[PDB]
Curated annotation (Swiss-Prot), chain A:
<comment type="subunit">
    <text>Homodimer; each gp6 molecule in the ring interacts with its two neighbors, forming an N-terminal dimer with one and a C-terminal dimer with the other. Heterotrimer with gp7; gp6 is part of a (gp6)2-gp7 heterotrimeric molecule. The (gp6)2-gp7 heterotrimeric molecule further interacts with gp25 and gp53; the gp25-(gp6)2-gp7 module is involved in sheath contraction.</text>
</comment>
<protein>
    <recommendedName>
        <fullName>Baseplate wedge protein gp6</fullName>
    </recommendedName>
</protein>
<comment type="similarity">
    <text>Belongs to the T4likevirus baseplate wedge protein gp6 family.</text>
</comment>
<comment type="function">
    <text>Baseplate protein that is located next to the tail tube (inner baseplate). Involved in the tail assembly. The gp25-(gp6)2-gp7 module is involved in sheath contraction.</text>
</comment>
Length: 326, 324, 50
């Protein structure tokens, strides 16, 4: 028993295609012993869905509790890097240089951060970035935590957490398409099926107890049917998106507990069927109050640029030389 | 630069830590040498007359190089370091000391030098480096140019050698003296009412230009004739009041892209006499986190003597539902 | 600890009138460590009850 004993158990019987193990138990889900497992190479163990996470299932000793071999709950860092260097000090291209900083940003992660109950610090990685040339003068960054959400429709039973604290309104997802039942025409073309607009999930400033709503919109006046319950969110209090289509009526569908660090929603709370949504998986961005981001139970801060390039933009800036004369 | 600076840097290496020459495009004919005491900030007028009197040593009859103290750019740093409770042995008061040293060691080595530059990203890695227990830091900077005369910018202008943001330029506050009597038996029979005032900049125009406007007044004590009339824009930062004061006026102007700042209080009929200061400090947010020096400007951390330009917030961590 | 360690423990201190040991723990009955013991001869160890 004991998760620690189990972590080993697997750092042996598998200690081949596995880099790390976190055996934690969830207080919401009794009798279930959860086993986080980093593939040591990629991200998901049998993304093929078990091929692997079923083999470990097939390891049994004692107890009335049952294993649930999962892939680690990944925290991502959407970094907007802005390194600046000296035109002259540089001998190879900006292209070769990028491939030089991300070689470092990786060295940091995989040595200090990509570990269980281990953490990430922006200041500490920007030291690694700075440390890629004779110049390279300095560097800026703007990060957000990312949680990848399977089934956009609704969060888990027990909500999703970051293992970190975010700021008011900080929480927002990427946009996805909502197929309004309605139909419209332009450019000599026809019905064009059903009108679609870009819609998304955002949080609101916390109330006097640490608790804002999780709202979704915009909409039409519209494509969502209003009840005694279902009513457009009452007031400004968050981040609205570009109505290049003019729209705006958002609806409440959950809440963030900022202090408790839990976020729940369920689109079924209004009456939209997942059919009315193109997507399956979405991204949930928030920006921390943390100058240090903590991983934790089954959570793991990882940097996989190749397979997750989207989570890193590098904007370089070249600089004129100074005094060359003496 | 070094052609003559170096020498000097030999006969005086025991004081001066930074020497460079330059001309002023404009003050044609004049060559100045900025020097920073290793021992602080401003060389003393005796230290300065000695050093000037080696100019005779090396024979030159023409008026020959003015020695002077460097044009300092200061970084008002608002630092935040979060550290691990377990791994920190001594006092918080100690830790600060330990890092406020690291900052200086970075400044002395990589920054306090002519045309070398300050990189917030670097000094933070110095901060990180100060203890084995300093998990991670963050930081917010401002630029401080310390103005010799508040009343009017130099003939030419004042510049940061760096890009600031909109409304960003703002001096501190200085007492303006209206001229009215207060009639208060508390302190006799007459105090001469004097309310604070500052000089801020407004938003870039179509074309890159802002207006350098000057803090709140009470209608009467500034005379307006058509031309010189209250500024109206709300495109700047107004200040905390307790008084009925909301009349700001326009002098000079900021050329944001060419960073030049000229103003002249005279543009409103207010003699120096009217203000009880002679020196001020101009702040402003950089655009970037890498800031630069140029002709005779020097960036410097002199913290036991400019302590007002650093603040440290620590955040002790354990494990852990919370660090703000 | 460890049932295996215990099984030995008894395959020694008793390894005389005992043939086999199974130290298992029941998931219904916490804090209790159960020790199956074959008498090596008969069926029940102290059918005389202990």
């Amino acid at each position: 028993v004991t998760a620690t004993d189990y972590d080993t158990f697997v750092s042996e019987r598998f200690g081949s295609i596995i880099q790390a193990v976190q055996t934690f138990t969830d207080s919401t889900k009794p009798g279930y012993a959860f086993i986080a497992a980093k593939p040591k190479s990629g991200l998901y163990l049998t993304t093929v869905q078990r091929e692997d996470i079923k083999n470990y299932l097939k390891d049994y000793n004692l107890a009335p509790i049952t294993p649930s071999i999962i892939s680690p709950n990944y925290l991502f860092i959407k970094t907007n890097l802005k390194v600046t260097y000296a035109l002259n000090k540089l001998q190879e291209s900006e292209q070769w240089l990028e491939g030089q900083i991300i070689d470092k940003i990786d060295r940091y992660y995989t040595e200090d951060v990509e570990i269980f109950n281990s953490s990430f610090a922006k200041s500490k990685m920007l030291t690694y970035v700075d440390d890629a040339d004779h110049s390279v003068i300095g560097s800026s960054a703007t990060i957000q935590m990312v949680r990848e959400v399977q089934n956009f429709y609704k969060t888990p039973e027990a909500g999703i957490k970051y293992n970190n604290q975010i700021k008011d309104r900080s929480m927002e997802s990427n946009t996805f398409s909502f197929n309004s039942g309605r139909k419209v025409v332009n450019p000599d073309t026809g019905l064009e099926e059903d009108v679609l607009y870009d819609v998304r999930i955002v949080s609101t400033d916390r109330d006097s107890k640490g608790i804002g709503k999780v709202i979704i919109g915009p909409f039409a006046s519209g494509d969502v049917t209003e009840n005694e319950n279902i009513q457009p969110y009452t007031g400004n209090d968050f981040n609205k998106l570009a109505n290049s289509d003019g729209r705006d009526k958002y609806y409440v569908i959950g809440e963030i507990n900022y202090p408790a660090d839990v976020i729940y929603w369920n689109i079924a709370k209004i009456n939209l069927t997942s059919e009315k949504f193109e997507v399956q998986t979405i991204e949930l961005y928030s920006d921390p109050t943390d100058d240090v981001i903590f991983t934790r139970d089954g959570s793991l801060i990882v940097f996989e640029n190749d397979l997750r390039p989207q989570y890193l933009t590098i904007d370089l800036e070249p600089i004129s030389q100074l005094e060359h004369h003496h």
